[PDB]
Symmetry: D2
Subunit: 259 residues, 4 copies
């Protein structure tokens, strides 16, 4: 099947940042024709640790900025919702509605996303076991979702640390398409945190094990990002990472197990 | 004074609430030094299965709770799941409770603080003790003056929660600490560990305990495996007050 | 039953340090007559992280120093072994043979300790689940051990950290007397580590839950210790801690569950 | 060259060793770029139950292994459990293996290094990746020149091990890294996860893989739930060499 690459700046810092990233993603979409690209960016960081951190410019502004990206580059769009009422307005531009990791068990939010008729991607909560995602997919199907994805983004491992149990990819694959969050899985919750040096190796692991797509937050200058400055991938490195995982995926694919 | 927050997990009916409320009222009269707070949810908004009991709704719930406060003069507390629920809930709730999974949702916290009520945040199973400092700051920023942090266990491998009692003294630096005696032994539980760990909580030192109690836990529509049998509540309360009395002498300064 | 308080300097830095601690332990044994004191000290730290750290002055010297303590103060003695051949010579002075946490599954070591006829105290490995200690006790009984103790000293929780799951006390109590290691449970493995501020609260928790004794490494000046300098309890604080746990134990005891 | 350490968990008999050794010899001739090392224990010294199979002893074991090296010209490796065993084992063993639980026992490490042989330390389930640096230092201090660190999983809650692949690049800073493909999926296991994770190990980058293989794992006297069926070894080796070939291009510098 067509490999999915979900990527974009963590937060919609501005409509300019988006178009700048969208341009590069469009270029890669033209090169990697065997890949389905989806532009990602949050109109709001509703779960920052500190009340003083950047959240965003609002739903209205965010949706409008995203529609511009889709309009200008013809790229599919995905963004996350935080409360039920947001599903409807977001569904107007988002091809895939994302459910935040902490909210992966909030029934009404999942139901709100599902009835829009859009695809739904649920980030697996850091407190959730792989096999417990079966009920998550069941809620979505109950709610009308026909295209469902489960995203691996790490599991709580002691304090301020996340480990990736790759056994989750084949387990979750039993009931939904699986995406690997290459940048969220290396973050250190409330650490400062994040270790950028592990993004690449862990993503190679993901494609070797086998998944249906990767998720990466990328920014022109991660150092200046308003969110996830420690984990966002420098935009100039995106192409190389993608070529690399496509190569590893190809050679490893004949060995992927049959669920 | 020492806080004791108790009640059935879910508002299965105002009938059940009234029965439990009667017993809590009784204990309330028997333990005058303890501040009792009746607790119950009008909706289990985070059940694993779409086919599980959620409740009878916010309206039916607030009504049932209203009847408990009016018929027994007991303070009330319930949890909210989305921002718009803060205001209507604040009508009856003296303490607005924030679900563990939602302890980082800024808008939910701000909405609860805005109501002027007291706010009790259940500590996420993914959160480190010291990271609750920022949770409190959000509430203070939002106008909350009576803030509580409730220890309910931490993710330990899959389908298991461990109680790191080091959290109590750490969280006490910036907020009053409550120990969730029934939520801490559940397996994302063993009722046999409820009393032992509640004893540990008061020996370590906390500002209150939190317990889900039901006449027939096995028949409860929620947390049937961890809810405390109503008949056992008095005995446990007496026990923890006695332990607290002796142990409080050694609680570390702030 | 008579509460057990196992205490002493982590390592036998010298025979003087031992007599100095032994004197204080003897004084407390005279005061707390409802307590059975056992003087503890390792003749060798065989598992230091660094090859450059203090290990000890050898078995010969250690045993001789311990025999002096027992001889001078009439105090029971306990020390740990690291290999099978050490059981016999150590058994000549030690009333209780201790098995290190990392070695709690080494069959021959456990068997070596058991055949001496001495009591055996096994530190629960940081990798072991509470219920898995049942087989540990079975090995010891198979080997002839008649007086067996299981010591809770924490469990691996993420990297360089240990958490105490107090549910282990009643679980392990099903097949052996249980001891709580108040100083080992707060150490941060390979941290530098240890957090002394948590020793007291966690020990209050232990007696409230209910155990058959406590284990504490105490040194006149923890800051100058050759081992566990970050976790050893200042000797001057020992009396107060003991009085405190006896008080909490008493008031909580009527509520201890029946296994 | 890339290392492939394989063989039956326990030396159930030199008969079994010879059969497995024959297949490993065959692969050895088929994969000339890979350095194969025959592995097997003469004693399961850390079994949970006193009533489980331990082995036939060090003498019978060293003899059986000697026969494999002489009959197939394959390098040998086995694990020691106490210091005195280092010397006699070094007679046959090209690589002395240090059990995971014993990775911190200084004397055991020094005794293995003293023999002049190569030393492979299984990383304790309680050890952080960066703390293996000191393990290597001990071996260097002891005279070891060929040092290996084997990733075999980390304690994750109770009765479970997780493989944190971040360890591979971290440990590679001070020693060659081997991935234990069968020990990492055992539950203190699911064979279905052996191949997926071994693929991940080579995509990330390691200097070799470690696998316990047996003609009939289900009948094996040790690790019957995690041992790889002998017939599947060739296929997995071919697969990991192909993945390595493509992925090695991206392994990070040191």
């Amino acid at each position: 099947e067509k490999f999915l690459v979900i990527a974009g700046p963590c937060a919609i810092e501005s409509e300019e940042l988006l178009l700048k990233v969208g341009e590069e993603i469009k270029r890669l979409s033209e090169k990697f024709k065997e890949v389905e690209f989806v532009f990602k960016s949050s109109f709001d960081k509703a779960n920052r640790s500190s009340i003083h951190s950047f959240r965003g410019h609002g739903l209205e502004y965010g949706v409008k900025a995203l529609r511009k990206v889709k309009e200008e580059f013809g790229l599919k769009i995905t963004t996350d919702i935080h409360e039920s009422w947001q599903a409807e307005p977001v569904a107007e531009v988002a091809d895939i509605i994302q459910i935040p990791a902490f909210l992966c068990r909030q029934t009404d939010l999942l139901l709100a996303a599902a009835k829009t008729g859009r695809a739904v991607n649920v980030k697996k909560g850091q407190f959730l076991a792989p096999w417990d995602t079966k009920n998550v997919v069941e809620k979505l199907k109950f709610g009308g979702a026909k295209e469902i994805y489960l995203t691996e983004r790490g599991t709580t491992f002691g304090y301020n640390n996340l480990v990736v149990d790759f056994r989750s990819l084949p387990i979750m694959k039993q009931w939904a398409k699986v995406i690997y969050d290459a940048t969220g899985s290396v973050q250190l919750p409330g650490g400062l945190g994040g270790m950028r040096e592990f993004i690449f190796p862990l993503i190679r692991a993901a494609v070797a094990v086998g998944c249906d797509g990767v998720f990466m937050e990328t920014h022109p200058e991660p150092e200046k990002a308003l969110s996830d400055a420690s984990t966002q991938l420098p935009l100039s490195q995106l192409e190389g990472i993608i070529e690399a995982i496509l190569e590893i995926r190809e050679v490893a694919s004949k060995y992927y197990e049959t669920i």
